[PDB]
mmCIF file of C-alpha atoms and ligand atoms in Angstrom:
data_model
loop_
_atom_site.group_PDB
_atom_site.id
_atom_site.type_symbol
_atom_site.label_atom_id
_atom_site.label_comp_id
_atom_site.label_asym_id
_atom_site.label_seq_id
_atom_site.Cartn_x
_atom_site.Cartn_y
_atom_site.Cartn_z
ATOM 1 C CA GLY A 1 -15.097 -8.412 -58.490
ATOM 2 C CA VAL A 2 -12.612 -10.596 -60.192
ATOM 3 C CA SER A 3 -9.781 -8.551 -62.128
ATOM 4 C CA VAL A 4 -6.657 -10.485 -64.439
ATOM 5 C CA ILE A 5 -3.636 -8.887 -65.381
ATOM 6 C CA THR A 6 -1.527 -10.008 -67.734
ATOM 7 C CA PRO A 7 1.135 -8.692 -69.445
ATOM 8 C CA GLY A 8 -0.363 -10.264 -72.734
ATOM 9 C CA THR A 9 0.039 -13.262 -74.778
ATOM 10 C CA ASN A 10 2.331 -12.484 -76.472
ATOM 11 C CA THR A 11 5.112 -11.680 -74.082
ATOM 12 C CA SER A 12 3.833 -13.888 -72.252
ATOM 13 C CA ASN A 13 0.975 -16.530 -70.325
ATOM 14 C CA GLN A 14 1.876 -15.822 -66.781
ATOM 15 C CA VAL A 15 -0.972 -13.682 -64.587
ATOM 16 C CA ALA A 16 -1.774 -11.984 -61.543
ATOM 17 C CA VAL A 17 -5.147 -12.328 -59.764
ATOM 18 C CA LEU A 18 -6.814 -8.619 -57.720
ATOM 19 C CA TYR A 19 -9.829 -9.439 -55.356
ATOM 20 C CA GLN A 20 -11.703 -6.457 -55.392
ATOM 21 C CA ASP A 21 -11.826 -4.696 -51.640
ATOM 22 C CA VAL A 22 -11.321 -8.276 -50.171
ATOM 23 C CA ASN A 23 -10.010 -8.606 -47.282
ATOM 24 C CA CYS A 24 -7.152 -11.023 -48.243
ATOM 25 C CA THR A 25 -7.379 -13.230 -45.561
ATOM 26 C CA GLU A 26 -10.893 -15.078 -47.485
ATOM 27 C CA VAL A 27 -10.443 -15.333 -50.411
ATOM 28 C CA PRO A 28 -10.128 -18.936 -50.742
ATOM 29 C CA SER A 29 3.817 -17.575 -52.885
ATOM 30 C CA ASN A 30 2.497 -13.705 -53.033
ATOM 31 C CA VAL A 31 -0.193 -11.874 -51.486
ATOM 32 C CA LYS B 1 -21.134 -2.406 -50.092
ATOM 33 C CA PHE B 2 -24.984 -2.881 -51.930
ATOM 34 C CA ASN B 3 -26.237 -5.237 -54.542
ATOM 35 C CA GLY B 4 -23.736 -5.565 -57.653
ATOM 36 C CA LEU B 5 -22.951 -1.698 -56.926
ATOM 37 C CA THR B 6 -19.376 -1.050 -56.359
ATOM 38 C CA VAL B 7 -16.530 2.128 -56.327
ATOM 39 C CA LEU B 8 -13.227 2.066 -58.348
ATOM 40 C CA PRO B 9 -10.915 4.403 -56.707
ATOM 41 C CA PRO B 10 -8.728 6.618 -58.941
ATOM 42 C CA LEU B 11 -5.734 5.792 -59.787
ATOM 43 C CA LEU B 12 -3.900 9.265 -58.775
ATOM 44 C CA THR B 13 -4.328 8.911 -54.888
ATOM 45 C CA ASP B 14 -5.230 12.351 -53.637
ATOM 46 C CA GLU B 15 -1.353 12.617 -52.007
ATOM 47 C CA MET B 16 0.221 12.562 -56.109
ATOM 48 C CA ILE B 17 -1.919 15.536 -57.145
ATOM 49 C CA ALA B 18 -1.018 17.714 -53.930
ATOM 50 C CA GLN B 19 2.219 16.864 -55.730
ATOM 51 C CA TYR B 20 1.916 17.410 -58.893
ATOM 52 C CA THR B 21 0.735 20.593 -57.809
ATOM 53 C CA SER B 22 3.464 21.991 -55.306
ATOM 54 C CA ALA B 23 6.020 20.411 -58.505
ATOM 55 C CA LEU B 24 3.641 23.130 -60.794
ATOM 56 C CA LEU B 25 4.472 25.822 -57.783
ATOM 57 C CA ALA B 26 7.534 25.602 -56.999
ATOM 58 C CA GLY B 27 7.886 26.276 -60.405
ATOM 59 C CA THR B 28 6.760 29.265 -61.251
ATOM 60 C CA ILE B 29 7.778 30.487 -58.060
ATOM 61 C CA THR B 30 11.182 30.079 -59.105
ATOM 62 C CA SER B 31 11.947 30.046 -63.381
ATOM 63 C CA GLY B 32 8.460 31.599 -64.416
ATOM 64 C CA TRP B 33 6.924 30.473 -67.659
ATOM 65 C CA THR B 34 10.645 29.434 -68.942
ATOM 66 C CA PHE B 35 9.863 25.285 -67.186
ATOM 67 C CA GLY B 36 6.664 25.238 -68.874
HETATM 68 C C1 NAG C 101 3.813 -10.096 -80.605
HETATM 69 O O1 NAG C 101 4.430 -11.064 -82.036
HETATM 70 C C2 NAG C 101 5.106 -10.344 -82.894
HETATM 71 C C3 NAG C 101 5.680 -11.811 -84.026
HETATM 72 O O2 NAG C 101 5.473 -13.462 -82.821
HETATM 73 C C4 NAG C 101 6.449 -9.722 -82.212
HETATM 74 O O3 NAG C 101 6.952 -9.197 -83.381
HETATM 75 C C5 NAG C 101 6.461 -9.020 -81.571
HETATM 76 O O4 NAG C 101 7.612 -8.702 -80.893
HETATM 77 C C6 NAG C 101 5.457 -9.000 -80.364
HETATM 78 N N1 NAG C 101 4.836 -7.281 -79.509
HETATM 79 C C7 NAG C 101 5.126 -7.751 -78.249
HETATM 80 C C8 NAG C 101 4.449 -6.243 -77.968
HETATM 81 O O5 NAG C 101 6.067 -8.898 -77.940
HETATM 82 C C1 NAG C 102 -8.487 -8.265 -42.575
HETATM 83 O O1 NAG C 102 -8.984 -9.162 -42.081
HETATM 84 C C2 NAG C 102 -7.435 -8.535 -40.394
HETATM 85 C C3 NAG C 102 -7.976 -10.041 -39.643
HETATM 86 O O2 NAG C 102 -8.542 -8.837 -38.722
HETATM 87 C C4 NAG C 102 -7.063 -7.331 -40.075
HETATM 88 O O3 NAG C 102 -5.957 -7.769 -39.182
HETATM 89 C C5 NAG C 102 -7.389 -6.962 -41.055
HETATM 90 O O4 NAG C 102 -6.691 -5.349 -41.108
HETATM 91 C C6 NAG C 102 -7.971 -6.627 -42.420
HETATM 92 N N1 NAG C 102 -7.754 -5.726 -43.602
HETATM 93 C C7 NAG C 102 -7.366 -4.681 -44.027
HETATM 94 C C8 NAG C 102 -7.352 -4.564 -44.942
HETATM 95 O O5 NAG C 102 -7.612 -4.018 -42.965
#
């Protein structure tokens, strides 16, 4: 699954992304 | 693990919950009912 973490569009438009229980070496800065 | 089925982890780990119970237990051994 893929989840999007946002502070709210009334604060910012930046976003972070969680790839759930996926090893972070096979996803396709801060990893 | 499976087909479209996943298990999400709880927000509090087991370490955090054991920390909470040791804080309750040290509060009661040492202050009685005053800390609540
Ligand atoms: C939402 O926007 C309004 C006006 O743009 C502002 O007054 C309010 O503080 C904002 N809320 C947050 C949580 O930033
Ligand atoms: C992801 O794969 C690498 C390569 O084998 C491994 O070293 C790493 O431990 C894996 N991730 C986790 C969370 O174990």
